[PDB]
């Protein structure tokens, strides 16, 4: 959970830099080392996430939501049934 | 004897206890603060709002079964014993709601329900799960009398589930518990058949044993059998106008039968049309867009012979459950196919098993509290 | 604040202790439950400040 | 693939194709009736594509996604523009180069404070709390002679 | 011009104790006839009168009871005719005009409007005393066509309306915003107005479930 | 003490009912000024020799891509759950095969003989009620059984949240 805020923190300076790198060439003559590097640096991210934009990927993902949440659901069920043997033998 | 004197022993104790709470709940916070402070058991003077009311719900129609027309006791019940408890300042605890549950207990026996817009509006006191079970019990019948059963299907599932978390521990119901379990079973079996194929809401409260039994009944009443509706009505016919119990079945008086007929004639005129409504919608909408030959494929199935095939189907389209259309140039009956979803019943029980962990963690640490 | 039952305080492990643990982390014993040492601390305010610890080399 | 793989057999080829995949070496859809063979991306990406968790091919695989990919790609590949081409971290971590240096000026004050304090602790914890381990060894001797009195 | 005048004395009557003993069949029962003359409506005023006929079957009238019944039929599909069945005994359900209008109410709520207007006595004494009953039936005729229908034939709507050909057909075509459609129809609704899926789009189930379980 | 013992000192020790998990203390919370120079190693990587700090950030992006971070743990968990629970239940059944399933027939043998002869022993009355091998609660296996199955729920609560925080982030960061 703390990695998510760290993942949002590295996200923030990326947007804080590269939107100024938009502004760099948009003022006079910036985005020189950022024209075809930061255009590639963002491409190094979007090759990882998001996948290009497939909807069957999201349908796989929403399945993989409903897969691992069902794993989380039965983890919550085995959370109880472990105790239901544990707590009955401690009456 | 052994009943009628004890009826009058109860009612005179009831109409006296109708008076002791009518006087000392309006201006006084003095006997109330006496009742909050010196008795530590909060139960007993909230028992009397349910113990004395439930047997008053018995004993009033016990005399009203004999005193059929020109009858005393419901006027003795509602106007003097119940409405005196109804319109007051609240006993600021679980008494002030249960005085309305005393009133709505006879405002349900009286079939005169419209004030369910009022009974929950002045019920701005905290809806405790002790009263919330009796809330969705009583209030859901007005939705069952609203003929909008797609909203009534969800209310009776709450009170039948009994994972609505009540625990009291001083015989609070009182002396009658599985009657509530069996009536809401029949009220939800009433709602199981009436809308299926759309529920798919018969799964949580009704368990899989009665899902098979009443669901096979749900097939047959929709496949045509009136024996299910005979089971659905006759098991439920006292369950709309029960006192809790009648007096004594006999042959000589004509009296007892006369409100027994009043229980029969009311709720058969409503649901028998719904038994025909369950037959009209019964066929699965196999395909959304029918041609005329497959319109006549379903006009065959709607009603044939012969005359009045289109107009009977017109009557059977217009039952709120067939949103359809004729393409008169194309010859293309364009209708609906409404279908539903199943799998989402794991999002509710994910916290219930987080409770089933915690509820197992609770009492055994309470056992560990008594052996610490 | 950090007491348990009548003799025990909490532990305070600074990072200079931690690095010597991750010299013998899950190596020199990977699928082998190396008891990676005994926590040599000192009893100070509310906390058992570990100062240095030594990895016990079981015959791994 | 029958032609593009010039194996000696075709039936024992396609069986050995499954004899990989039946024993979880890759993802195939071979008993399609018209004899196709798809793979999928990702769509099977748990173990069976890997043979069994470790590949035998070279790193021609594509970007697949598992647990905490999207979080940790937000960690690195979003910071991939943050460390090197930026000045926004360079102004922040040169600040942190000085923000430590304020604590490092305090660290030299702590290089004399631990010199003042924990040197005294170095001698006292060598003696005082070492007696408290020896107190646990002396109280055990105390309970032995006490038990040797009322029997 | 009579509804809101006698509404308050009725509204005080219905929300007190004034409705379990048959002594209030002279403020409410004329107010049922007030519902008749004006095509405005109160239900418990009808329903209390019915309770005073059920609890003591010695006061049971015919006109006001059918004025309860016909103002039940004007406000369909509310449960007023339901609450009509809730009190009237079956021996009281067989008296003119209680029995006939309960038979009219069988043909209205089940949408037998062909069978309604044919088996309706085309002019009957209390149909006109309830003002707008001709309107509110043909409202409730074209009500169920509004929710549960797409496209109708030119005959087929006036067939639902009853004993009409084209003129008052258009008085229930140009009233509810209905055009004509080509060869030969009335644009009741669109073709997309039929399916209307209510529960297909579910399983967005992450955010509520993980948040009660993250800790 | 000592210790947790198997058939004796397990009914006795669990009627006192000592806890099974207790006091996992909070460990590192403060700048204790042993910190000093590793703080000063942080500012340098921070600074212009910053190639080693991004490599630890590079250790994030590949920890999430291809490892069965949930599944291989859960498969070790489902291994540990299907084994250690049933053995406690094989403990719980075998004790109830002895606590009562013996004593349902032990008293049945005892009550049948009219509980003794007056002029003589009471021979078999002394012979009957021989105690079974678990008579009480088996609360040496059961305590660490109560520990390690609770430790399985920690691995569950690990596998629950680590599931969520990606099922958030994938549904999050794909969605643009």
PDB file of C-alpha atoms in Angstrom, chain E residues 79-203:
ATOM      1  CA  UNK E  79     -53.525  -0.536  -5.653  1.00  0.00           C
ATOM      2  CA  UNK E  80     -56.890   1.012  -5.033  1.00  0.00           C
ATOM      3  CA  UNK E  81     -58.904  -1.800  -6.597  1.00  0.00           C
ATOM      4  CA  UNK E  82     -56.618  -4.093  -4.593  1.00  0.00           C
ATOM      5  CA  UNK E  83     -57.761  -2.347  -1.416  1.00  0.00           C
ATOM      6  CA  UNK E  84     -61.295  -2.568  -2.796  1.00  0.00           C
ATOM      7  CA  UNK E  85     -60.922  -6.355  -2.640  1.00  0.00           C
ATOM      8  CA  UNK E  86     -59.384  -6.016   0.821  1.00  0.00           C
ATOM      9  CA  UNK E  87     -62.681  -5.307   2.609  1.00  0.00           C
ATOM     10  CA  UNK E  88     -65.729  -6.102   0.450  1.00  0.00           C
ATOM     11  CA  UNK E  89     -67.139  -9.512   1.426  1.00  0.00           C
ATOM     12  CA  UNK E  90     -68.104 -11.921  -1.369  1.00  0.00           C
ATOM     13  CA  UNK E  91     -71.776 -11.602  -0.451  1.00  0.00           C
ATOM     14  CA  UNK E  92     -71.159  -7.849  -0.728  1.00  0.00           C
ATOM     15  CA  UNK E  93     -69.151  -8.505  -3.937  1.00  0.00           C
ATOM     16  CA  UNK E  94     -72.384  -9.656  -5.615  1.00  0.00           C
ATOM     17  CA  UNK E  95     -74.536  -6.521  -5.531  1.00  0.00           C
ATOM     18  CA  UNK E  96     -75.217  -3.891  -8.161  1.00  0.00           C
ATOM     19  CA  UNK E  97     -73.009  -2.082  -8.984  1.00  0.00           C
ATOM     20  CA  UNK E  98     -70.262  -3.632  -6.828  1.00  0.00           C
ATOM     21  CA  UNK E  99     -70.163  -6.928  -8.736  1.00  0.00           C
ATOM     22  CA  UNK E 100     -70.257  -5.413 -12.232  1.00  0.00           C
ATOM     23  CA  UNK E 101     -67.481  -2.902 -11.584  1.00  0.00           C
ATOM     24  CA  UNK E 102     -65.354  -5.547  -9.896  1.00  0.00           C
ATOM     25  CA  UNK E 103     -65.948  -7.376 -13.186  1.00  0.00           C
ATOM     26  CA  UNK E 104     -64.946  -4.165 -14.964  1.00  0.00           C
ATOM     27  CA  UNK E 105     -61.885  -4.056 -12.719  1.00  0.00           C
ATOM     28  CA  UNK E 106     -61.050  -7.599 -13.766  1.00  0.00           C
ATOM     29  CA  UNK E 107     -61.052  -6.460 -17.388  1.00  0.00           C
ATOM     30  CA  UNK E 108     -59.076  -3.261 -16.799  1.00  0.00           C
ATOM     31  CA  UNK E 109     -56.094  -4.333 -14.664  1.00  0.00           C
ATOM     32  CA  UNK E 110     -55.525  -7.500 -16.689  1.00  0.00           C
ATOM     33  CA  UNK E 111     -55.786  -5.333 -19.859  1.00  0.00           C
ATOM     34  CA  UNK E 112     -58.934  -6.807 -21.374  1.00  0.00           C
ATOM     35  CA  UNK E 113     -60.033  -3.420 -22.685  1.00  0.00           C
ATOM     36  CA  UNK E 114     -61.762  -5.030 -25.656  1.00  0.00           C
ATOM     37  CA  UNK E 115     -63.585  -7.277 -23.196  1.00  0.00           C
ATOM     38  CA  UNK E 116     -63.998  -4.278 -20.871  1.00  0.00           C
ATOM     39  CA  UNK E 117     -65.782  -1.822 -23.191  1.00  0.00           C
ATOM     40  CA  UNK E 118     -67.865  -4.592 -24.755  1.00  0.00           C
ATOM     41  CA  UNK E 119     -69.030  -6.057 -21.422  1.00  0.00           C
ATOM     42  CA  UNK E 120     -69.238  -2.559 -19.981  1.00  0.00           C
ATOM     43  CA  UNK E 121     -72.769  -1.290 -20.171  1.00  0.00           C
ATOM     44  CA  UNK E 122     -71.812   1.488 -22.600  1.00  0.00           C
ATOM     45  CA  UNK E 123     -73.696   4.029 -20.531  1.00  0.00           C
ATOM     46  CA  UNK E 124     -74.008   3.026 -16.880  1.00  0.00           C
ATOM     47  CA  UNK E 125     -75.213   5.308 -14.041  1.00  0.00           C
ATOM     48  CA  UNK E 126     -71.985   5.841 -12.138  1.00  0.00           C
ATOM     49  CA  UNK E 127     -69.545   5.878 -15.068  1.00  0.00           C
ATOM     50  CA  UNK E 128     -70.535   9.504 -15.678  1.00  0.00           C
ATOM     51  CA  UNK E 129     -70.743  10.424 -11.982  1.00  0.00           C
ATOM     52  CA  UNK E 130     -67.049   9.571 -11.775  1.00  0.00           C
ATOM     53  CA  UNK E 131     -65.749  12.405 -13.939  1.00  0.00           C
ATOM     54  CA  UNK E 132     -63.005  11.542 -16.406  1.00  0.00           C
ATOM     55  CA  UNK E 133     -63.592   7.794 -16.129  1.00  0.00           C
ATOM     56  CA  UNK E 134     -63.781   7.732 -19.934  1.00  0.00           C
ATOM     57  CA  UNK E 135     -60.463   9.603 -19.927  1.00  0.00           C
ATOM     58  CA  UNK E 136     -58.715   7.707 -17.146  1.00  0.00           C
ATOM     59  CA  UNK E 137     -59.577   4.278 -18.518  1.00  0.00           C
ATOM     60  CA  UNK E 138     -58.250   5.313 -21.926  1.00  0.00           C
ATOM     61  CA  UNK E 139     -55.371   6.838 -20.007  1.00  0.00           C
ATOM     62  CA  UNK E 140     -54.835   3.438 -18.370  1.00  0.00           C
ATOM     63  CA  UNK E 141     -55.460   1.764 -21.725  1.00  0.00           C
ATOM     64  CA  UNK E 142     -52.633   3.739 -23.319  1.00  0.00           C
ATOM     65  CA  UNK E 143     -50.646   3.683 -20.055  1.00  0.00           C
ATOM     66  CA  UNK E 144     -49.699   0.011 -20.438  1.00  0.00           C
ATOM     67  CA  UNK E 145     -49.039   0.655 -24.132  1.00  0.00           C
ATOM     68  CA  UNK E 146     -46.587   3.331 -23.002  1.00  0.00           C
ATOM     69  CA  UNK E 147     -44.383   1.109 -20.846  1.00  0.00           C
ATOM     70  CA  UNK E 148     -44.698  -2.280 -22.511  1.00  0.00           C
ATOM     71  CA  UNK E 149     -45.103  -1.701 -26.245  1.00  0.00           C
ATOM     72  CA  UNK E 150     -43.167  -0.464 -29.316  1.00  0.00           C
ATOM     73  CA  UNK E 151     -45.258  -0.133 -32.474  1.00  0.00           C
ATOM     74  CA  UNK E 152     -48.940  -0.673 -33.113  1.00  0.00           C
ATOM     75  CA  UNK E 153     -51.250  -0.941 -36.113  1.00  0.00           C
ATOM     76  CA  UNK E 154     -53.723   1.856 -36.905  1.00  0.00           C
ATOM     77  CA  UNK E 155     -56.609  -0.431 -35.989  1.00  0.00           C
ATOM     78  CA  UNK E 156     -54.755  -2.034 -33.112  1.00  0.00           C
ATOM     79  CA  UNK E 157     -54.584   0.993 -30.799  1.00  0.00           C
ATOM     80  CA  UNK E 158     -58.218   2.027 -31.262  1.00  0.00           C
ATOM     81  CA  UNK E 159     -58.950  -1.653 -30.718  1.00  0.00           C
ATOM     82  CA  UNK E 160     -57.186  -1.280 -27.356  1.00  0.00           C
ATOM     83  CA  UNK E 161     -58.963   2.051 -26.781  1.00  0.00           C
ATOM     84  CA  UNK E 162     -62.304   0.502 -27.685  1.00  0.00           C
ATOM     85  CA  UNK E 163     -65.011   1.288 -30.277  1.00  0.00           C
ATOM     86  CA  UNK E 164     -62.847   3.863 -32.072  1.00  0.00           C
ATOM     87  CA  UNK E 165     -61.659   4.001 -35.679  1.00  0.00           C
ATOM     88  CA  UNK E 166     -59.400   6.972 -36.417  1.00  0.00           C
ATOM     89  CA  UNK E 167     -60.630  10.136 -34.691  1.00  0.00           C
ATOM     90  CA  UNK E 168     -60.472   9.528 -30.938  1.00  0.00           C
ATOM     91  CA  UNK E 169     -57.725   7.115 -31.884  1.00  0.00           C
ATOM     92  CA  UNK E 170     -55.819  10.295 -32.758  1.00  0.00           C
ATOM     93  CA  UNK E 171     -57.110  11.811 -29.518  1.00  0.00           C
ATOM     94  CA  UNK E 172     -55.054   9.034 -27.901  1.00  0.00           C
ATOM     95  CA  UNK E 173     -52.334   9.244 -30.535  1.00  0.00           C
ATOM     96  CA  UNK E 174     -51.742  13.003 -30.657  1.00  0.00           C
ATOM     97  CA  UNK E 175     -52.197  13.151 -26.857  1.00  0.00           C
ATOM     98  CA  UNK E 176     -49.399  10.870 -25.601  1.00  0.00           C
ATOM     99  CA  UNK E 177     -46.847  12.102 -28.143  1.00  0.00           C
ATOM    100  CA  UNK E 178     -47.347   9.371 -30.739  1.00  0.00           C
ATOM    101  CA  UNK E 179     -46.627   9.799 -34.424  1.00  0.00           C
ATOM    102  CA  UNK E 180     -47.679   7.569 -37.265  1.00  0.00           C
ATOM    103  CA  UNK E 181     -45.253   5.102 -38.818  1.00  0.00           C
ATOM    104  CA  UNK E 182     -45.166   4.035 -42.436  1.00  0.00           C
ATOM    105  CA  UNK E 183     -47.638   1.496 -43.885  1.00  0.00           C
ATOM    106  CA  UNK E 184     -49.381   1.445 -41.509  1.00  0.00           C
ATOM    107  CA  UNK E 185     -48.676   2.240 -37.897  1.00  0.00           C
ATOM    108  CA  UNK E 186     -48.763   4.539 -34.917  1.00  0.00           C
ATOM    109  CA  UNK E 187     -45.362   5.372 -33.435  1.00  0.00           C
ATOM    110  CA  UNK E 188     -46.041   4.266 -29.868  1.00  0.00           C
ATOM    111  CA  UNK E 189     -42.418   3.892 -28.852  1.00  0.00           C
ATOM    112  CA  UNK E 190     -39.194   3.042 -30.640  1.00  0.00           C
ATOM    113  CA  UNK E 191     -37.983  -0.450 -31.459  1.00  0.00           C
ATOM    114  CA  UNK E 192     -35.151   0.021 -28.935  1.00  0.00           C
ATOM    115  CA  UNK E 193     -37.808   0.699 -26.252  1.00  0.00           C
ATOM    116  CA  UNK E 194     -38.502  -3.019 -25.916  1.00  0.00           C
ATOM    117  CA  UNK E 195     -35.577  -4.880 -24.321  1.00  0.00           C
ATOM    118  CA  UNK E 196     -34.359  -2.356 -21.654  1.00  0.00           C
ATOM    119  CA  UNK E 197     -31.913  -4.618 -19.747  1.00  0.00           C
ATOM    120  CA  UNK E 198     -31.900  -4.028 -15.998  1.00  0.00           C
ATOM    121  CA  UNK E 199     -29.199  -6.397 -14.670  1.00  0.00           C
ATOM    122  CA  UNK E 200     -26.577  -7.295 -17.300  1.00  0.00           C
ATOM    123  CA  UNK E 201     -23.780  -4.841 -16.590  1.00  0.00           C
ATOM    124  CA  UNK E 202     -22.681  -6.030 -13.144  1.00  0.00           C
ATOM    125  CA  UNK E 203     -19.338  -7.230 -11.672  1.00  0.00           C
TER     126      UNK E 203
END
